[PDB]
Amino acid sequence: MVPISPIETVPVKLKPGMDGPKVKQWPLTEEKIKALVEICTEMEKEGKISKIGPENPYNTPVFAIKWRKLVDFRELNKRTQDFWEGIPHPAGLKKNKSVTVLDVGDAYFSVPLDEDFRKYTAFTIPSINNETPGIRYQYNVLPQGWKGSPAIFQSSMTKILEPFAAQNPDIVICQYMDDLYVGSDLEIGQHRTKIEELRQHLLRWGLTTPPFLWMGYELHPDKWTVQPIVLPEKDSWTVNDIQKLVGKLNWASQIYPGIKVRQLSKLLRGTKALTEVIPLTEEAELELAENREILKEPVHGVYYDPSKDLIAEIQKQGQGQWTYQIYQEPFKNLKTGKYARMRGAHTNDVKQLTEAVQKITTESIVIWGKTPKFKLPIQKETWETWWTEYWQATWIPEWEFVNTPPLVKLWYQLEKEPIVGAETFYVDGAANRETKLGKAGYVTNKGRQKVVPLTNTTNQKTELQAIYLALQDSGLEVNIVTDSQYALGIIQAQPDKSESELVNQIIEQLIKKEKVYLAWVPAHKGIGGNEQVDKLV
Amino acid sequence: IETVPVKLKPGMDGPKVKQWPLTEEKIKALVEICTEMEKEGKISKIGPENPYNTPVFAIKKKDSTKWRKLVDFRELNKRTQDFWIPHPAGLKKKKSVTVLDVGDAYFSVPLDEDFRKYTAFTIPSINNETPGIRYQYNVLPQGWKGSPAIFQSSMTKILEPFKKQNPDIVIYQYMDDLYVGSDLEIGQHRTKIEELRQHLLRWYELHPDKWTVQPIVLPEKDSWTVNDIQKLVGKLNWASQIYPGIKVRQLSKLLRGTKALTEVIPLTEEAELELAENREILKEPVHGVYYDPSKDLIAEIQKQGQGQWTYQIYQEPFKNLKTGKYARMRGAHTNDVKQLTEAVQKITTESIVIWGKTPKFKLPIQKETWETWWTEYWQATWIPEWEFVNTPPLVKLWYQ
Numbered sequence: 026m027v028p029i030s031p032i033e034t035v036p037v038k039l040k041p042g043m044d045g046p047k048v049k050q051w052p053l054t055e056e057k058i059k060a061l062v063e064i065c066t067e068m069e070k071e072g073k074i075s076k077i078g079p080e081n082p083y084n085t086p087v088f089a090i091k092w093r094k095l096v097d098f099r100e101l102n103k104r105t106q107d108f109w110e111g112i113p114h115p116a117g118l119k120k121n122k123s124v125t126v127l128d129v130g131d132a133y134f135s136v137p138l139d140e141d142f143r144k145y146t147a148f149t150i151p152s153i154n155n156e157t158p159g160i161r162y163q164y165n166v167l168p169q170g171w172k173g174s175p176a177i178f179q180s181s182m183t184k185i186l187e188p189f190a191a192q193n194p195d196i197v198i199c200q201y202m203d204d205l206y207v208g209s210d211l212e213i214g215q216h217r218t219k220i221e222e223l224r225q226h227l228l229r230w231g232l233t234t235p236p237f238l239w240m241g242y243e244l245h246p247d248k249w250t251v252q253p254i255v256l257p258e259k260d261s262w263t264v265n266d267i268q269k270l271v272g273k274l275n276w277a278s279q280i281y282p283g284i285k286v287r288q289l290s291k292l293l294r295g296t297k298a299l300t301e302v303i304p305l306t307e308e309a310e311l312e313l314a315e316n317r318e319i320l321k322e323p324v325h326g327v328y329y330d331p332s333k334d335l336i337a338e339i340q341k342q343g344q345g346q347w348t349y350q351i352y353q354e355p356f357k358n359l360k361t362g363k364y365a366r367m368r369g370a371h372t373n374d375v376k377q378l379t380e381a382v383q384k385i386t387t388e389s390i391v392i393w394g395k396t397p398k399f400k401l402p403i404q405k406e407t408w409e410t411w412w413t414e415y416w417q418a419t420w421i422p423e424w425e426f427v428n429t430p431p432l433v434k435l436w437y438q439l440e441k442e443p444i445v446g447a448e449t450f451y452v453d454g455a456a457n458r459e460t461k462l463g464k465a466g467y468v469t470n471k472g473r474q475k476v477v478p479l480t481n482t483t484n485q486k487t488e489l490q491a492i493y494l495a496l497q498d499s500g501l502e503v504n505i506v507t508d509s510q511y512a513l514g515i516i517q518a519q520p521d522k523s524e525s526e527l528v529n530q531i532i533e534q535l536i537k538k539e540k541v542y543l544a545w546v547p548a549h550k551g552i553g554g555n556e557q558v559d560k561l562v
Numbered sequence: 563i564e565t566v567p568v569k570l571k572p573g574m575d576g577p578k579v580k581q582w583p584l585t586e587e588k589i590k591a592l593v594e595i596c597t598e599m600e601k602e603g604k605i606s607k608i609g610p611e612n613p614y615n616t617p618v619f620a621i622k623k624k625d626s627t628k629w630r631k632l633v634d635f636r637e638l639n640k641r642t643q644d645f646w647i648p649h650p651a652g653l654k655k656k657k658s659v660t661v662l663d664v665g666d667a668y669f670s671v672p673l674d675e676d677f678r679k680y681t682a683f684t685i686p687s688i689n690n691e692t693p694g695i696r697y698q699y700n701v702l703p704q705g706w707k708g709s710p711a712i713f714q715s716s717m718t719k720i721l722e723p724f725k726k727q728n729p730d731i732v733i734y735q736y737m738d739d740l741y742v743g744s745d746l747e748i749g750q751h752r753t754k755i756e757e758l759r760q761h762l763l764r765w766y767e768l769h770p771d772k773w774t775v776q777p778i779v780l781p782e783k784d785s786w787t788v789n790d791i792q793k794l795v796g797k798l799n800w801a802s803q804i805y806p807g808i809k810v811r812q813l814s815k816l817l818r819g820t821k822a823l824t825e826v827i828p829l830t831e832e833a834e835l836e837l838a839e840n841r842e843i844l845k846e847p848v849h850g851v852y853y854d855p856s857k858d859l860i861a862e863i864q865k866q867g868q869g870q871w872t873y874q875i876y877q878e879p880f881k882n883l884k885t886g887k888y889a890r891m892r893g894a895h896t897n898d899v900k901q902l903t904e905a906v907q908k909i910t911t912e913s914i915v916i917w918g919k920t921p922k923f924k925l926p927i928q929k930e931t932w933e934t935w936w937t938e939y940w941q942a943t944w945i946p947e948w949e950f951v952n953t954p955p956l957v958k959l960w961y962q
């Protein structure tokens with residue numbers, strides 16, 4: 026007998042203050058019992074389990090389902106300590122000339138459970154007609170379904186495989202789920218040779234045993250893709266069905282370019298239900314139709330070659346949607362993706378471009394461990410002006426301008442100094458809260474004035490209204506004095522788009538303007554030109 | 563040579579904190595470092611039975627191309643009991659202060675056996691392929707709050723000859739850092755610090771005197787536009803939240819009517835007197851401003867453009883413990899985030915020198931941007947706490 030290296034057990038403890046599981050053994054049919062006896066018999070013959078006595082107060086219920094024994098550890102997992110813990114992405118793997126598969130189903134039960142914990146795994150098989158004490162049993166190995174079995178199994182296996190990994194950089198190895206997958210670029214002879222070497226290495230521990238379907242992916246030696254996407258086709262649409270649909274679309278968006286999930290996700294707002302028949306806007310129908318039309322033909326991503334540049338390129342899809350491709354060489358994509366704006370009040374394209382860049386950066390660090398070179402639809406000058414003048418710190422990693430409309434631009438720029446020869450509009454607004462009744466307006470140095478009465482409004486909305494008014498009635502250059510910190514706060518953030526239609530109209534006005542100086546003063550200080558008396562009434 | 567019993571605080575478990583992604587070079591460097599740390603018994607590989615985790619990454623300090631292992635202990639630190647040196651309030655008064663890294667020393671002392679589980683950390687793998695390399699500490703870890711507190715006895719025992727030799731030199735210790743102040747001449751000071759380095763061996767320079775607290779100033783102009791006066795009044799109205807007797811009414815009275823912003827307005831006598839009295843008031847210090855050690859320090863930072871940054875340290879609003887400004891060019895000009903990060907570091911260092919603890923920053927930046935880039939520029943062994951402000955403050959233009 027060649028001596029086997031023992032797999033060292035991992036010490037396992039129960040959560041503090043907790044006692045091991047005690048749960049009533051379920052009554053069964055004579056048939057099921059007859060099956061369980063044979064199963065547990067051959068298992069005991071294989072050393073997987075062992076018969077125990079009454080000295081063990083702990084009991085775990087056991088079922089039989091059609092043959093197959095099922096131990097329900099549900100109450101043991103709640104009383105068992107936390108263990109330590111994210112799948113790899115195909116765009117991160119490398120091309121493999123040959124990939125060989127080996128069965129590890131023999132080695133799963135070769136991982137021993139910590140002895141002092143074994144007593145907690147106890148389960149009982151009821152005898153015929155309940156006329157005897159049920160056969161008592163405990164696990165000597167990691168039980169299928171237990172809390173810590175996956176972590177401990179993969180830990181032991183990793184620990185085993187590590188020495189024949191590090192010594193063979195020309196070999197790649199992975200375990201899914203019951204299998205061992207090896208791969209290499211070596212000539213077929215050298216590959217088979219190394220396979221044999223590994224088989225022997227595992228033999229030491231006493232383990233004698235394309236395209237691949239792996240985690241919703243299809244893996245080919247030369248490339249990868251997603252397993253086919255089935256989008257349910259029904260004239261009736263449920264909420265859970267919207268969730269499933271959106272999920273599958275997101276899943277498909279990592280390789281298929283141009284996928285848009287917004288219109289379908291807009292309908293999931295503030296609703297927890299598994300059943301409603303929810304209509305769809307023509308926008309949503311066209312969206313799903315376009316996704317069906319994109320999915321009409323298959324596409325493939327390639328694997329990663331460290332010897333080449335890593336490039337990310339981004340395009341504006343419109344309506345808060347952005348789409349990106351990541352490739353080493355033109356038209357051959359490592360992978361693709363999308364980015365949707367956060368739920369804001371007011372926002373602009375430059376901030377969204379920034380956010381997308383950061384997202385892609387982090388994703389790239391996860392997958393390839395490095396930051397890609399960016400190709401962005403924004404001119405160097407625009408980014409310059411923006412980041413120099415922005416009140417917030419901002420940064421983008423190395424990048425270049427790619428000219429692919431629509432371009433990201435700055436739609437307006439406020440002046441740094443008051444404008445000479447330009448009319449000065451002192452604006453204000455006020456609203457009585459209980460009646461919701463208010464006034465908005467302005468006075469100017471030239472004597473120009475307005476006050477507009479407003480129903481169903483507030484101080485903030487009137488303060489915005491006043492500014493809008495001053496923008497409507499002024500020439501291409503204008504100075505505007507406001508006392509509103511709210512308004513100034515909104516405009517100093519530089520939105521090019523807003524939820525509020527008022528702010529939107531303001532933006533349109535700013536866009537039409539050649540020069541706008543926006544100045545602030547404190548309210549109610551009697552500062553000349555600022556007239557509370559007009560709007561307050 | 564013997565471990566002091568250490569525990570957590572009542573009703574708290576060990577930290578389980580997600581490890582963020584690292585680049586290929588940072589991972590390689592951390593592997594090269596932890597390998598040797600493992601051969602030296604400083605750390606040890608652990609198993610799946612350890613649920614906890616603490617983040618880790620790698621930095622580079624000044625004048626060194628060699629990487630350093632940085633563990634982010636903030637969570638574990640706040641889960642430790644502490645309460646085991648009253649701050650040296652003369653350290654900020656010295657002509658010069660030098661910062662030395664004594665972290666290495668901590669590895670000469672063992673950590674309590676039961677506590678080691680809570681120092682667990684993970685070298686991540688690229689693309690989630692292999693599980694990470696997991697370690698736990700054996701000796702005293704750098705960045706942990708318990709390390710200086712526990713090693714403190716040995717530190718006092720080491721520095722006795724130097725301290726008693728010249729009792730003009732102030733010595734302070736914060737985390738892995740040792741701050742040594744002196745009033746001597748910079749050459750003789752540097753040679754004295756060299757002497758201290760050799761003295762420590764057998765077992766960055768500051769000038770806190772070059773700083774004071776910044777006053778609020780008002781313009782001196784020979785002619786005022788309406789705009790100039792509107793700004794002046796805004797600023798004074800802001801200052802009135804700080805100082806008692808500020809009065810804007812004559813200055814406002816200059817503006818009555820509705821006028822063009824660029825129009826020059828001559829100051830009346832009442833207005834000039836009022837402005838004078840306001841200057842006088844702004845000269846005096848702020849009233850009833852005191853440091854309460856039981857309260858958090860708060861740092862606010864504003865980007866002034868063109869490489870300039872203003873900041874304030876306080877505890878209660880409109881009571882400022884310190885105010886400052888930074889133009890420094892370290893090669894960060896094309897990068898806002900590097901400037902912000904250097905700024906946060908500097909401000910933190912000043913905060914440590916003065917009050918002995920770090921403040922909690924409020925940064926002019928988005929969470930996602932900062933979080934993506936700040937480790938690239940970080941040269942310090944400690945990590946402060948920070949929030950993010952997404953709505954532009956008006957105080958910016960009043961601190962410039």
Ligand SMILES: Cc1cc(/C=C/C#N)cc(C)c1Nc1nc(Nc2ccc(C#N)cc2)nc(OCCCN2CCOCC2)n1
Nearest residue numbers: 113118119120121197199206235237238239244245246688
């Ligand atoms: C073998 C294997 C099988 C499956 C699923 C099977 C089922 N069911 C899943 C994985 C994840 C792996 N493991 C693997 N596969 C590849 N390539 C590859 C090529 C072709 C085909 C086909 N046909 C399949 C796979 N490359 C690597 O690793 C290289 C990364 C090197 N670096 C190190 C530095 O940081 C960055 C990564 N690992």
Ligand SMILES: [Mg+2]
Nearest residue numbers: 453454508509
């Ligand atoms: Mg108002």
